[PDB]
Amino acid sequence: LDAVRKRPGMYIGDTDDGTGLHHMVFEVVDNAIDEALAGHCKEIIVTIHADNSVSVQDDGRGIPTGIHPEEGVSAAEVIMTVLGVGVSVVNALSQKLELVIQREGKIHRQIYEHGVPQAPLAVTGETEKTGTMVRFWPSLETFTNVTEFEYEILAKRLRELSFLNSGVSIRLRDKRDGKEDHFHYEGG
Amino acid sequence: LDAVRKRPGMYIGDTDDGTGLHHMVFEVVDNAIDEALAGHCKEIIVTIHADNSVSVQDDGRGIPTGIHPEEGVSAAEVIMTVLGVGVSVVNALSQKLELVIQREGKIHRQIYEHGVPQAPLAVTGETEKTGTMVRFWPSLETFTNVTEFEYEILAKRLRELSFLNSGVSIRLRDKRDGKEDHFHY
Ligand SMILES: COC(=O)c1ccc(O)cc1O
Ligand SMILES: COC(=O)c1ccc(O)cc1O
């Protein structure tokens, strides 16, 4: 990921005017929609947290968690750390990223800081649900000037996305003021 | 450098008991000694700055500044960013690293943060001198508990090295409390 860290703008866009910042969210949302679409219920939830982080949850199959035979770490870690621009860009430019995968009856958790995993992906519990949750805190060493997420930017785009993704329920919640929306197009 | 950042202990030593922290200095010094050897005056200066950083200067030839034919960046940057553990380890585990190379009549500078160059190696002026200077600020995200350099740990090792590298002058200065030593065999 050092190529990304060296010139973040080439990968995420303008790091000073808010466009790249919001692109971080959109990239994560794109992956979540792809996960959601591979299932029947299909719901993603995008939350703006009070601490300036954004989380995206889906109820898909869960990102694969087995050890990659060549890389020697979990498949999920490979996806997060090896170079849509890919979620690895988002991870690289996040001061923190929390990953929770529910899959095969197990909860898996991992934390990254600036794209560096703090520990290997760990099974920390049991669950009857499936899905992937990514919560990221954009790096304030990278994102300058505009550093807070604008609800309207996310809502406008999530609305447009709903009409191209039939059957996918998209919920948006802003924990800073309680505002929420629900975009669900059932066409097709 | 991500392999290093992921398991810093495996590359530099214990990051909690002061071991690794001091090893950072020793790695830089090894490079410096090698540079000093290949020069005329043969002196290196190790300084513990008041802001918990350490600088190592030599009067050697200056590390090569030309573009590495294969990597496409300065040879100096290749050394600082591509994996005696190598100075790239120190760079990866430093929140900041300043590189100053005096070579072929020119001063060159570059700044890294957590191993990431802030800009390409750049010519900033002219000089009659030659040598390399590296100043690093260890990452307090990596080094915990023992985070301040212990003068005596550095002194002991530099003394050992002075006997082994006879002819090379080694100065140690602590700017925190004015303490200083000169190792020369
Ligand atoms: C490749 O999968 C991902 O990156 C991802 C998947 C699901 C999700 O809710 C968020 C994500 O970032
Ligand atoms: C590659 O060399 C280095 O890392 C280096 C570091 C410090 C120094 O005084 C001289 C050097 O050559």
Ligand SMILES: Nc1nc2ccccc2[nH]1
């Ligand atoms: N604060 C900070 N910035 C970083 C950039 C790359 C890797 C680790 C880092 N820690």
